[PDB]
Structures are given as structure tokens and as C-alpha cells.
């Protein structure tokens, strides 16, 4: 447990120092692709649960 949490704290600190590894253009590619998928799938967003909800 102690070792694992150490290397953990290491990886967090290295993720803050070294910045996001996903770069940028890649991330845009992901977001865009997902957008196209949900588009062709007619998926309507899930709204917030209303105060009156019978279920």
C-alpha cells in the first residue's frame, strides 16, 4: 500500500509538471469523433432529474 501510494503521488506530480499527455490536436480528434457518432445516433441528451419525477 505504501509503495503504491508513493509511486501514485509521483505520477500525479509528474502529470501536473509535465502537463497533459494527450497533447491537443489528438484531444480535438477524440471530441470531434464522439460528436459525429452521437450525431448519427440521434442520441438526445440526458436532462437533469426534475423535482417531480414519478420514478
Amino acid at each position: 500500500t505504501r509503495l503504491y501510494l508513493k509511486a501514485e503521488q509521483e505520477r500525479q506530480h509528474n502529470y501536473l509538471k509535465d502537463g497533459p499527455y494527450i497533447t491537443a490536436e489528438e484531444a480535438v480528434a477524440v471530441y470531434t469523433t464522439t460528436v459525429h457518432w452521437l450525431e448519427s445516433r440521434r442520441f438526445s441528451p440526458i436532462p437533469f432529474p426534475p423535482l417531480s419525477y414519478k420514478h
Partner: peptide, 27 residues
């Protein structure tokens, strides 16, 4: 004086990268 030793009174007994900006603004 140099060899004064701080008493070891016992307690038992951060920076950020700017790439986050480029990413977040990109998204």
C-alpha cells in the same frame, strides 16, 4: 555555533505547466 543541532522535536513521537492552458482553450 555551526554544530548547533536543531532539536529533532518529533511530529510523530507546487507548480503547474502552461500546456494545460493550450489544451483547455483548444477544447
Amino acid at each position: 555555533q555551526e554544530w548547533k543541532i536543531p532539536p529533532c522535536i518529533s511530529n510523530w513521537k507546487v507548480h503547474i505547466n502552461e500546456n494545460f492552458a493550450k489544451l483547455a482553450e483548444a477544447l
